[PDB]
Amino acid sequence: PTTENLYFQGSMNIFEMLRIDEGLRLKIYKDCEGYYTIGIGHLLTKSPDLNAAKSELDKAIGRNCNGVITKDEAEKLFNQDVDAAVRGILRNAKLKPVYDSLDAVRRCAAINHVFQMGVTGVAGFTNVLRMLQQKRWDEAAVNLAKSRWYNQCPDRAKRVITTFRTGTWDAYKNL
Ligand SMILES: O=[N+]([O-])c1ccc(O)cc1
Numbered sequence: 001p002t003t004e005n006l007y008f009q010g011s012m013n014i015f016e017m018l019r020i021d022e023g024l025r026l027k028i029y030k031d032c033e034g035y036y037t038i039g040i041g042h043l044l045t046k047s048p049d050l051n052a053a054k055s056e057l058d059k060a061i062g063r064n065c066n067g068v069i070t071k072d073e074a075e076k077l078f079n080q081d082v083d084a085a086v087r088g089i090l091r092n093a094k095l096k097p098v099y100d101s102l103d104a105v106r107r108c109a110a111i112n113h114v115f116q117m118g119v120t121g122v123a124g125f126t127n128v129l130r131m132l133q134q135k136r137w138d139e140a141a142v143n144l145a146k147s148r149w150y151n152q153c154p155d156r157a158k159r160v161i162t163t164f165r166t167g168t169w170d171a172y173k174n175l
């Protein structure tokens with residue numbers, strides 16, 4: 001690796017990772033699963049009603065957005081969502097010990113998955129959690145590749161599953 005390459009891990013962190021996986025959109029859009037989203041992967045609602053999505057948005061931002069936010073607002077909301085994912089893992093008796101056992105880069109992949117899927121969905125992956133605690137990386141990654149999370153929307157999950165397999169940032173290079 002070049003000097004520049006060895007610097008690339010320092011440029012990577014959970015925010016930079018989720019920003020690649022989720023994109024940045026300033027207007028309400030439907031995700032790969034059809035669901036109303038804004039900012040950096042902020043899910044607004046499962047309802048098919050745009051007006052519900054807008055109501056959730058104004059609540060989340062605190063003004064009358066009419067479906068549109070600023071980059072600064074998207075970042076503030078993203079930071080709240082990242083904090084909520086981290087807090088969700090740490091207060092959970094099933095996820096905390098696995099997270100604690102992980103290295104820094106796999107801890108980012110853990111936060112990413114919980115941000116995407118939520119704590120209860122993630123904490124139900126009994127096998128994957130045991131495999132990770134036992135450092136069975138290849139098996140963990142194959143088991144995550146069976147999930148509806150990955151298979152319903154592969155592009156958004158593929159880099160996270162590679163990161164659990166390798167513990168490096170290689171999947172985030174060369175966009
Ligand atoms: O803290 N943030 O809102 C961020 C950080 C990094 C990034 O690439 C986008 C947003």
Ligand SMILES: O=[N+]([O-])c1ccc(O)cc1
Pocket residue numbers: 089095096097098099100109110111113114122125128129132
């Ligand atoms: O918090 N965790 O330890 C996690 C979270 C997600 C995952 O897929 C595996 C472990």
